[PDB]
């Protein structure tokens, strides 16, 4: 007698009770999902990580979290995800299929309209994530497992790498580099060892697959949800990028940027920033140019005056970054950063070659001030660049793929679109102008 | 020096830490809270039937299966943990409101014709808005020790304050009164048959005419926010009307069973005969090859062994609900029809019904044995309206993707009335009025 309910008997809680026995591995599935789809984002946006809270803008959300374990790999371990509200305060746990909608309003707002990915029969990464609930979860590493049965079983992986003509380059991420994540989260063993290890295991074979991913300073990777090529039907196409190879060294003896000399109406100097006060005309230039509307819209450097003073001296003192002034026919209207690529953000998503350099720049007196004059600046550079380091073999940019008068400018005096790529703000078109 | 891949742990670390994790409890039943709003109106907007026990229903991609502890008389249902089950019934995950969301537009978008709004490329989707509302401040929960003497007095205030005659807007007393029974239902603060007798009392107290109809009508207004050819998401919902059965109507009227029209001229229509002995007989073998023809079959979706139509006949023909007939042409059996009463059909949840509205579902068997087919329903329609003179229309259901015969049925003089959500899909319902 209840009638809104069923009336309820000890063998009736007993069936109730044990379906909600799964539900903490059911929770614990979600987990694990959401944080593959965060560490994917974080890998293909080029995302730095530190160990410690991290926070993120994702489309219309703001997520956090905190990393517990920063990877070498990028396998980190998680704290809870969380949505925070514009104030900071927790408004939801960050579930997969949250995650894959957030993720996929903000990559298909990062390529262009005209990009496959969003196409109107591209589907979307919801759609992926949604019709692979029912697939099989891959067994997790046995959390007693050996470092010795760990290296085991990576010398196994990597020696059965097809390392023949023909085989896929992205196979040693795929492969080898996600064992070494697993066991690193695991706790079973150090990644950076393991690294070592799986280094050594390359050279025994003197393939040309294994000379390659020891000498290159990136590697080929797959992407699922950043990228204009992308589709999901439902299933995701995947798209190849480039990513940092932690097998290759550190630092090298690559000179600083050179001061080029441009030809033409065009002048420029280095930036002169004064020990005494404070810190001089250069460093007002610079600061005032970089908190005016149009600039901030694309460098997004707004900064006080003493951050900028700072950044300045701080980019002179070093062997990346080099901040110049542009003259044209006598008046200061241009600020650059010509940096060296090895030592800049820029070496994790492309296969770089050592000496070559890039070019930020922003025009400050466009205010009454240039039409055409772009193409003409970023020529003169580019040229100029190439003749002050005759090992340069190339300068490349990353303009916003949104910044369509910019990449217009780069094309027009001779750069190239060589790829799309993604960073921690933006997908940028790839501008390269070769030497030949 | 000692951790690089971590962070050095110190008891203020764990303290902040820990108090973040504390608010974790609430964040889970918000999205619990949320999950269980929109299961709440995608049974609703579906008409999909709800009983104390299991629940198993099919949104777009994923299977969901859910307790119901409370059934609400309001729709106001309480759950137990919602889950996405695989093909064989194993639970895969948890259901959250986004996971939801996107099951459930992706459902609705497909039930819904290309053309329409809820399918254009600028149109948003329930996706969209269950995103941009995570930030939305949570909407006070009943408190849990009001007495049902306060529920009263809320709820009578309430009933008396609704706009009543002027500026209309029906859906209001759904939309606030209802509400309110439901979540004191669910709350456990009084019982809502209970709290439905109270809230008519006070709608007979003024007989102004919106009172008078909402006492009356077999259904209420009720405004949609997932199913719907008309939504929007602008990021917010553009919400659309539709209707659902009204508690306060008693019905249950001493409806005969359908009767047998008759019609003239080249047509020719019979009830069906189920044997008893042996195979079932002739016409329970005519069905069963007609539906598992493919033309018939990609519509009614019931190609059966002919063993479970014998007992589907039986079970039709021995009931007060529909009524099966064997149609013929000039000599040959041509087509089947199942003629039925409304007021005990699922479509009596969909539309204000009058008691003796008759229905009719139809599948043409010896196709063009072309044109035909609208003529043959202009005469069933008519044929129906003589014989049973206290009948108001007759209405048919096809799928709205059915375009042929949605247009055969307006061809033969029913009219596209509404778009109706039914359990496993959107129907565009044809009335051919007597008046
Ligand atoms: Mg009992
Ligand atoms: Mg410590």
Redesign the interface.
């Given at each position: 007698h209840?009638s809104?309910?069923?009336d309820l008997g000890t063998e009736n809680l007993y069936f109730?009770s044990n379906?909600?026995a799964?539900?903490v591995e059911?929770?614990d599935?979600?987990r694990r999902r959401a944080c593959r789809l965060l560490r994917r984002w974080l890998a293909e946006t080029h995302t730095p990580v530190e160990?410690?809270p991290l926070s993120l803008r994702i489309g219309?959300?703001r997520v956090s979290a905190?990393v517990?374990?920063?990877?070498?790999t990028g396998a980190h371990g998680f704290?809870?995800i969380?949505?925070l509200?514009?104030e900071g305060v927790?408004?939801?746990?960050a579930?997969?299929?949250?995650l894959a909608?957030?993720c996929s309003?903000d990559s298909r707002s990062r390529s262009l309209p005209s990009a496959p990915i969003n196409a109107?029969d591209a589907g979307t990464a919801?759609?992926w994530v949604?019709?692979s609930?029912?697939d099989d979860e891959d067994d997790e590493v046995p959390a007693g497992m050996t470092a010795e049965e760990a290296v085991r079983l990576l010398s196994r992986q990597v020696d059965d790498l097809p390392r023949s003509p023909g085989a896929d380059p992205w196979s040693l991420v795929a492969g080898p580099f996600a064992a070494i994540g697993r066991f690193?989260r695991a706790g079973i063993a150090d990644?950076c060892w393991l690294l070592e290890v799986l280094a050594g295991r390359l050279r025994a074979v003197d393939d040309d697959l294994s000379r390659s991913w020891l000498s290159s300073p990136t590697l080929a990777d797959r992407a699922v949800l950043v990228g204009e090529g992308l589709r999901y039907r439902?299933d995701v196409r995947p798209v190849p990028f480039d990513v940092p190879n932690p097998l290759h060294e550190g630092k090298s003896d690559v000179p600083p940027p050179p001061v080029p000399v441009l030809g033409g109406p065009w002048s420029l100097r280095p930036v002169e920033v004064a020990v005494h006060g404070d810190g001089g005309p250069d460093v007002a230039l610079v600061h005032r140019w970089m908190n005016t509307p149009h600039v901030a819209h694309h460098w997004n450097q707004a900064w006080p005056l003493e951050r900028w003073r700072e950044e300045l001296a701080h980019q002179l003192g070093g062997e990346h970054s080099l901040p110049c002034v542009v003259g044209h026919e006598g008046r200061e209207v241009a600020y650059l950063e010509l940096y060296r690529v090895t030592r800049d953000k820029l070496a994790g998503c492309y296969p770089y070659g050592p000496h070559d350099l890039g070019v930020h720049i922003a025009i400050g007196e466009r205010e009454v001030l240039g039409r055409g004059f772009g193409s003409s600046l970023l020529r003169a550079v580019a040229g100029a660049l190439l003749d002050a380091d005759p090992r340069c073999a190339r300068v490349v940019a990353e303009p916003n793929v949104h910044n369509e008068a910019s990449v217009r400018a780069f094309a027009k005096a001779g750069f190239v679109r060589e790829r799309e790529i993604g960073l921690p703000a933006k997908n940028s078109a790839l501008m390269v102008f070769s030497r030949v």
């Amino acid at each position: 007698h209840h009638s809104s309910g069923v009336d309820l008997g000890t063998e009736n809680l007993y069936f109730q009770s044990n379906a909600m026995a799964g539900d903490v591995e059911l929770a614990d599935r979600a987990r694990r999902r959401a944080c593959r789809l965060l560490r994917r984002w974080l890998a293909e946006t080029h995302t730095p990580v530190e160990p410690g809270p991290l926070s993120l803008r994702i489309g219309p959300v703001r997520v956090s979290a905190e990393v517990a374990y920063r990877s070498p790999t990028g396998a980190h371990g998680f704290g809870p995800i969380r949505v925070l509200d514009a104030e900071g305060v927790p408004v939801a746990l960050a579930d997969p299929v949250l995650l894959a909608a957030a993720c996929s309003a903000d990559s298909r707002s990062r390529s262009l309209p005209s990009a496959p990915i969003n196409a109107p029969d591209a589907g979307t990464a919801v759609d992926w994530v949604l019709s692979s609930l029912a697939d099989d979860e891959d067994d997790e590493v046995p959390a007693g497992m050996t470092a010795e049965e760990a290296v085991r079983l990576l010398s196994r992986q990597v020696d059965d790498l097809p390392r023949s003509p023909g085989a896929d380059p992205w196979s040693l991420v795929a492969g080898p580099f996600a064992a070494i994540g697993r066991f690193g989260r695991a706790g079973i063993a150090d990644e950076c060892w393991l690294l070592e290890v799986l280094a050594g295991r390359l050279r025994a074979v003197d393939d040309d697959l294994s000379r390659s991913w020891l000498s290159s300073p990136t590697l080929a990777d797959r992407a699922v949800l950043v990228g204009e090529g992308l589709r999901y039907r439902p299933d995701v196409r995947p798209v190849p990028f480039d990513v940092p190879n932690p097998l290759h060294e550190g630092k090298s003896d690559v000179p600083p940027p050179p001061v080029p000399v441009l030809g033409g109406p065009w002048s420029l100097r280095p930036v002169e920033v004064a020990v005494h006060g404070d810190g001089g005309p250069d460093v007002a230039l610079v600061h005032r140019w970089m908190n005016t509307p149009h600039v901030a819209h694309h460098w997004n450097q707004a900064w006080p005056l003493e951050r900028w003073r700072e950044e300045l001296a701080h980019q002179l003192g070093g062997e990346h970054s080099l901040p110049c002034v542009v003259g044209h026919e006598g008046r200061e209207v241009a600020y650059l950063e010509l940096y060296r690529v090895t030592r800049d953000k820029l070496a994790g998503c492309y296969p770089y070659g050592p000496h070559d350099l890039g070019v930020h720049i922003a025009i400050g007196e466009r205010e009454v001030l240039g039409r055409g004059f772009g193409s003409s600046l970023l020529r003169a550079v580019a040229g100029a660049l190439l003749d002050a380091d005759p090992r340069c073999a190339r300068v490349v940019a990353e303009p916003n793929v949104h910044n369509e008068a910019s990449v217009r400018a780069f094309a027009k005096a001779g750069f190239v679109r060589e790829r799309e790529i993604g960073l921690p703000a933006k997908n940028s078109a790839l501008m390269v102008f070769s030497r030949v």
